Amino acid sequence: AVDTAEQVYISSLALLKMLKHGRAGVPMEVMGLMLGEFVDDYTVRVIDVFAMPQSGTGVSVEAVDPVFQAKMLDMLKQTGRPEMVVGWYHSHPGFGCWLSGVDINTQQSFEALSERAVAVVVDPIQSVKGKVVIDAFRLINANMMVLGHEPRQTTSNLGHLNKPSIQALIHGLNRHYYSITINYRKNELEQKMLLNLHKKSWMEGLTLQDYVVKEMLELAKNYNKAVEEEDKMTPEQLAIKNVGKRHLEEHVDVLMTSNIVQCLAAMLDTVVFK
Amino acid sequence: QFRNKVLRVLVKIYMNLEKPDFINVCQCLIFLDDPQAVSDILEKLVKEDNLLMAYQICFDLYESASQQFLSSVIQNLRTDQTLKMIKILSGEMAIELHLQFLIRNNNTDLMILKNTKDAVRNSVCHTATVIANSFMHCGTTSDQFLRDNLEWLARATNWAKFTATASLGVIHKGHEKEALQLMATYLPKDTSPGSAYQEGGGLYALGLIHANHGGDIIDYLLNQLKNASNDIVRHGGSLGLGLAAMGTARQDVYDLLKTNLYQDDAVTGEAAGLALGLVMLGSKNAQAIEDMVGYAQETQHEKILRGLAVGIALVMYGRMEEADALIESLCR
Amino acid sequence: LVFTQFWFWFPLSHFLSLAYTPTCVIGLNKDLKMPKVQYKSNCKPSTFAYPTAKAKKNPARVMPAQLKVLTMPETCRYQPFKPLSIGGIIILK
């Protein structure tokens, strides 16, 4: 009967599905439902997510198709272990994450259906690995506003929750809402598999063709030698100047690494082969 | 290793001296942990009839020794002068006189409480205020600073009030003898039967009162926990029971604690695990550590695991580089 | 330790009660005989009077730094068995 600083675990599969689905229909403002799982009031988890079919209505409650969800749930029960649908996600491409009247109506409907009905908001605003614009919201009824909003009983997690603070538009519509802490679900096997993926796939680590390297190197070193020779004037003047109450140029770590690697290539050249 | 041998050699040298100064004789008991040795020297003093030194060394060790072996010392002493010796090496008459000293002298300012009150924020810092007032008169049994206003405890969520009643208990620390009736005065049924939060807080306060103070309160709390709800109340009750039986190593409480841990409950299980760790304080009992570590990775709750963390940490301690196997296992 | 852990839980704060040992210096001659000793601090109260080098008092709010400076009042018939270098429960004879 009291809220707290709860947490939602998101499986890597879940966030990947959410982001790809959102990018799929950015102009269309796509939406869907998740298949989450209950552990306790403090924490709740989500593992799988499916895409509700495109509908011209938008994020309307009617957009949910009972036959579609029933069929998907039955199929999942047949193959693997499904779980009850925690809530809904949608992409609000406008600016960051927030909610609207229709969104709050849908959330209220689900809250009538279940307990948390957590809402998820994504956007096309993304970075290569540095945006995660996703966010999670949950509504507050207007009956208990006399009572405390979110009874807090932990300083560390409450402060961590406040660290994201609230977005400009979020304050513009923060009422009837209270964001809930999100975190990536523990990931080891998936983490290890991805880490192996990077070396060979997401960046040049084939390790068999890993070793121009003697064609253009002469020219690159020529450019950098000329540039350093030029830059050497500024330290000259700086030293020339007296006490009087742009020498820092580095440009040497790059040459160091490049040509030391090129020289080391002799190890492949003379021994590894032949 | 060198420490024990040098200590025993030097204490032998000392008692070989004409006057076995009990101050330097306490090294065996407090550093070399020779409860039998301290018992024997106390017996020699008793037959020598110098009760002055007897209770001097008794108080010295009592205020500068761990109960785990004081129990053995008392056992050896037991099997008049003997009765007085047992009393002083008994349920903390030193604590009684300390609390008498504390109540006899207090310097507390109401204006600080008032400055907190008028600066009320209508937010979580209610709990911070109640705990601060608890710290103010810890063991003073002077709640009038709070008895004056009955709204600071009437304007909190059912959960913070648990902390408030725990603070009330903390203010009243050391009476022991009357603690039963004193807590009953604010008994959960008397205060708020519907607030099971206060129900658990009552047991938590009762446990806090007898901090390290062994007695029948341990068995009483054991029975209460046995006949009570598994989750809604058991958190505070189990926590207090574990605290009151700290380091007692008794199996009759260990069984209940392990059952609670194995009741796969989150709201109270973390307190259960904290108590489990507390009771097995520095025992190095491999059975307990293996049980707790195995159960840690076996469940799927954070709160349970967060509590079990400190529980394990407190299980085995004071061994320097002795439990390194466990350290490495947990570190990796 | 429990206090440090209280960042993830508030109710645990009360545990600091266990970590509270007052600096009062307790003195008793007989089993219960309260003594009328008044050690002379031989220093300015200043620190003592927290809201003329001397001090008197049973145990009082005397701190280890002030305890080390306290002077044992031999003028009285009974005296402590062990010195009064640092506080605690020093019995008298």
UniProtKB/Swiss-Prot annotation, chain A:
Organism, scientific name: Homo sapiens
Positions of short motif JAMM motif: 90-103
Residues forming coiled coils: none
Record's function text: Component of the 26S proteasome, a multiprotein complex involved in the ATP-dependent degradation of ubiquitinated proteins. This complex plays a key role in the maintenance of protein homeostasis by removing misfolded or damaged proteins, which could impair cellular functions, and by removing proteins whose functions are no longer required. Therefore, the proteasome participates in numerous cellular processes, including cell cycle progression, apoptosis, or DNA damage repair.
Binding annotation for Zn(2+): 90, 92, 103
Subunit structure: Component of the 19S proteasome regulatory particle complex. The 26S proteasome consists of a 20S core particle (CP) and two 19S regulatory subunits (RP). The regulatory particle is made of a lid composed of 9 subunits including PSMD4, a base containing 6 ATPases and few additional components. Within the complex, PSMD4 interacts with subunit PSMD7 through their respective MPN domain. Interacts with TXNL1.
Cellular component GO terms held in the UniProt record: cytosol; cytosolic proteasome complex; extracellular region; ficolin-1-rich granule lumen; nucleoplasm; nucleus; proteasome accessory complex; proteasome complex
Pfam family, one: JAB
Name of the protein this chain belongs to: 26S proteasome non-ATPase regulatory subunit 14
Tissues where the protein occurs: Widely expressed. Highest levels in heart and skeletal muscle.
EC nos: 3.4.19.-
First-tier enzyme category under EC: hydrolase
GO BP annotations, alphabetical order: double-strand break repair via homologous recombination; double-strand break repair via nonhomologous end joining; proteasome-mediated ubiquitin-dependent protein catabolic process; protein deubiquitination; protein K63-linked deubiquitination; regulation of proteasomal protein catabolic process; response to ethanol; ubiquitin-dependent protein catabolic process
Single annotated GO MF: K63-linked deubiquitinase activity
Curated annotation (Swiss-Prot), chain C:
Top-rank taxon: Eukaryota
Role, per record: Component of the 26S proteasome, a multiprotein complex involved in the ATP-dependent degradation of ubiquitinated proteins. This complex plays a key role in the maintenance of protein homeostasis by removing misfolded or damaged proteins, which could impair cellular functions, and by removing proteins whose functions are no longer required. Therefore, the proteasome participates in numerous cellular processes, including cell cycle progression, apoptosis, or DNA damage repair.
Family from the record: Belongs to the proteasome subunit S1 family.
Subunit structure: Component of the 19S proteasome regulatory particle complex. The 26S proteasome consists of a 20S core particle (CP) and two 19S regulatory subunits (RP). The regulatory particle is made of a lid composed of 9 subunits, a base containing 6 ATPases and few additional components including PSMD1. Interacts with ADRM1. Interacts with ZFAND1.
Protein name, UniProt field: 26S proteasome non-ATPase regulatory subunit 1
Annotated source species: Homo sapiens
Gene name for this UniProt entry: PSMD1
